[PDB]
Every structure is written in structure tokens, then in C-alpha cells.
């Protein structure tokens, strides 16, 4: 028929599936764009909250 | 004719290249196709770009996973054109498709092997000169394909090495013709001429 009243959906489809992760250690899916002029160093670090 | 036929996709028209590739399989002929990024489609780029988005919207409503899958890669755009020409849901169909391999660029083995062409699908022999047409690689890159630049990089590298090969070869074949000539006018040579050689 048609909603009747409009409302935004409930929640974000960009975070599906909402399943348990494959690991405790979330993955870096991307690193900073490389500028080969600067000196060498890391681009991340491990820690505990 | 030959155990494997390697086809330089370049400068061929998808559904004509497909139509012959399909038949070839069904008849027992193994085939590999290369440079599918340099494959052609009649119609200006915009037309086929619009066409491709038509393809994009089709998807299983309740679950976009069960639904039609959209591969963006030039080889894989090709394979779609091809699979549709094969009864791919039968043993015999699954069989024929396995005699097929498609590739962007020309990866090893196939780059030292010779590639052939299919004149009845060559663009330059088929399209009326003047008509607008489309390159797979540019089309794909427009709909998501991630790897045009890399293929291009690797190819230019490949094209260099092969230019050495050729040069090296054209050198050797010049010598051969030279030798082959200082043997001309001899008896054996005149005899062969007589017999068509």
C-alpha cells in the first residue's frame, strides 16, 4: 500500500552481515598512501586498551 | 587442427569472438583467449556503458547474493558473452567450458606461444569504417574493474621483451635467407623449383 508515514530505515546496511568476526584482531584493510620522499617508518602500532 | 588455440582478443568483436569460441569448444577444441581488455564492442562507449548498468540493476530482490552476478573484468565480460552460447547447465556444456580459458594480457606460457586471430570477428574486417565502437578495458574500468593500469604496465614490459625476441629472430632469419640463396642456382635447388619448391 504505502508506508502511511515515512521514517528512515532502522540501521545501516553497510555493516552487514552482523556476524561474529573471524578474529579478535580486526584487520587493517588499508594503509596511508605512500610518499617515498619521507624517511622510513611504520604506519601503525599494536596496543591493548 | 592443434591441441590448443591461443587467440589475441585484441581487435575482435565480443559476440563474434564468442560465437566462434563457443562452437570450437562444443566440437572438442581447447581454446585460450588473451588480451580480453583489448576486445571490442560495436557502439560508442556510452551506449555499452548504459547497457552495462542495465545489467547492474538486475539482482534478487530478497537477497542480492542469490541474484545475477556482475563481473567487471574484461575476460569475465567476455566469458559471459560466451557462456550464454553454451548449454552451460548440462554435463556436455560444463565440459566444453572447461576447454576454455580467458585472460587479461598475455601471462606466461601463452606469451611465448603463438596467438592466432578470427577474421570473421576481427573488427577491422567487419565493422563498416566510420561506425563507433568500444574497448573492453575502458568499459570495465568504468564499471569497477580494478586492474587496467597494472595490466598495461606489465604489458608494456612484456612488449619490450618480445621486441628483443623478434629483432633477434629477424636477424637470424636474414642469415638464413642469405645461406638459402648461396644454395640457389645449384642442382638440388633447380630440381625443387621444378616440383613447386
Amino acid at each position: 500500500s504505502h508506508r502511511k508515514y515515512e521514517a528512515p530505515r532502522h540501521g545501516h546496511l553497510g555493516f552487514l552481515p552482523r556476524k561474529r568476526a573471524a578474529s579478535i584482531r580486526a584487520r587493517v584493510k588499508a594503509f596511508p598512501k605512500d610518499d617515498r620522499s619521507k624517511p622510513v617508518a611504520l604506519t601503525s602500532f599494536l596496543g591493548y586498551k | 587442427v592443434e591441441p590448443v588455440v591461443v587467440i589475441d582478443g585484441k581487435g575482435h568483436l565480443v559476440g563474434r569472438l564468442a560465437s566462434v569460441v563457443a562452437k570450437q569448444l562444443l566440437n572438442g577444441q581447447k581454446i585460450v583467449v588473451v588480451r580480453a581488455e583489448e576486445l571490442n564492442i560495436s557502439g560508442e562507449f556510452f551506449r555499452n556503458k548504459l547497457k552495462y548498468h542495465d545489467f547492474l540493476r538486475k539482482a534478487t530482490a530478497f537477497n542480492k547474493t542469490r541474484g545475477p552476478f556482475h563481473f567487471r573484468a574484461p575476460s569475465r565480460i567476455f566469458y559471459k558473452a560466451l557462456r550464454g552460447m553454451v548449454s552451460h547447465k548440462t554435463a556436455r556444456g560444463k565440459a566444453a567450458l572447461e576447454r576454455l580459458k580467458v585472460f587479461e594480457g598475455i601471462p606466461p606460457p601463452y606469451d611465448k606461444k603463438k596467438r592466432v586471430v578470427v577474421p570473421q570477428a576481427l573488427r577491422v574486417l567487419r565493422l563498416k569504417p566510420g561506425r563507433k565502437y568500444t574497448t573492453l578495458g575502458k568499459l570495465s574500468t568504468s564499471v569497477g574493474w580494478k586492474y587496467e593500469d597494472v595490466v598495461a604496465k606489465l604489458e608494456a614490459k612484456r612488449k619490450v621483451s618480445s621486441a628483443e625476441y623478434y629483432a633477434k629472430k629477424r636477424a637470424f632469419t636474414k642469415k638464413v635467407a642469405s645461406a638459402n640463396a648461396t644454395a640457389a642456382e645449384s642442382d638440388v635447388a633447380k630440381q625443387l623449383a621444378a616440383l613447386g619448391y
Binding site: - | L25, L26, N27, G28, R92
Partner: protein, 106 residues
């Protein structure tokens, strides 16, 4: 020599068929290097072997053979119709086959 081949290579294409109904009693054969009905008239009557292998030895061999004959040409591009003693298995659609040179008429 390196070659010994006394036959001509060939391919089991389909059965005789309509759009939706096939007739296993006639096979269709693509004969290497034959392009026209005229061309294929040469081969009419030549005998054809489909040669396959098996796990059980029998009359002392692991190689069996279905035998047949070319019977008539088929359509415009050198394809040929054939019958066999027993119809060919249909898994063979796309398999090779040998056409011999006998009965000779040269």
C-alpha cells in the same frame, strides 16, 4: 617414420536432430579439411572407427572400437552423416574418430 596415420581425423558433433528431438541412429561427423558437400562426396562410404579404452581386458586388449560408415553429406560446409554398428555413446560428442581410406576408389 614419425607419422604412421592411415586415417583422416574427425569429430563426433551431434546426433541427427530437430530443434528438440534427436535421432541416435545417425551421427554427424566433421572431417578434418573438408569444407563443402562436394569435397565430402569423396568420403562417402569410407569406414569409420571410434576407438576407445577400458579397464577390463577382453579379447586380449584394453582397446575397443565402434565401427561405422559415412553414408551421405550433411548441409553446406563439408559435414557428413554416418551410421555405426551400434549408435555412438553421446558422451563422444566432441570426441575424435578416424575415417579410413577404404573402400578405395583411386
Amino acid at each position: 617414420a614419425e607419422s604412421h596415420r592411415l586415417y583422416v581425423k574427425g569429430k563426433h558433433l551431434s546426433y541427427q536432430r530437430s530443434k528438440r528431438v534427436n535421432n541416435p541412429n545417425v551421427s554427424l561427423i566433421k572431417i578434418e579439411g573438408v569444407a563443402t558437400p562436394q569435397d565430402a562426396q569423396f568420403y562417402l562410404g569410407k569406414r569409420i572407427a571410434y576407438v576407445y579404452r577400458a579397464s577390463k581386458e577382453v579379447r586380449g586388449s584394453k582397446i575397443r572400437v565402434m565401427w561405422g560408415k559415412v553414408t551421405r553429406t550433411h548441409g553446406n560446409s563439408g559435414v557428413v552423416r554416418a551410421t555405426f554398428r551400434n549408435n555412438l555413446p553421446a558422451k563422444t560428442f566432441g570426441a575424435s574418430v578416424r575415417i579410413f581410406l577404404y573402400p578405395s576408389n583411386i
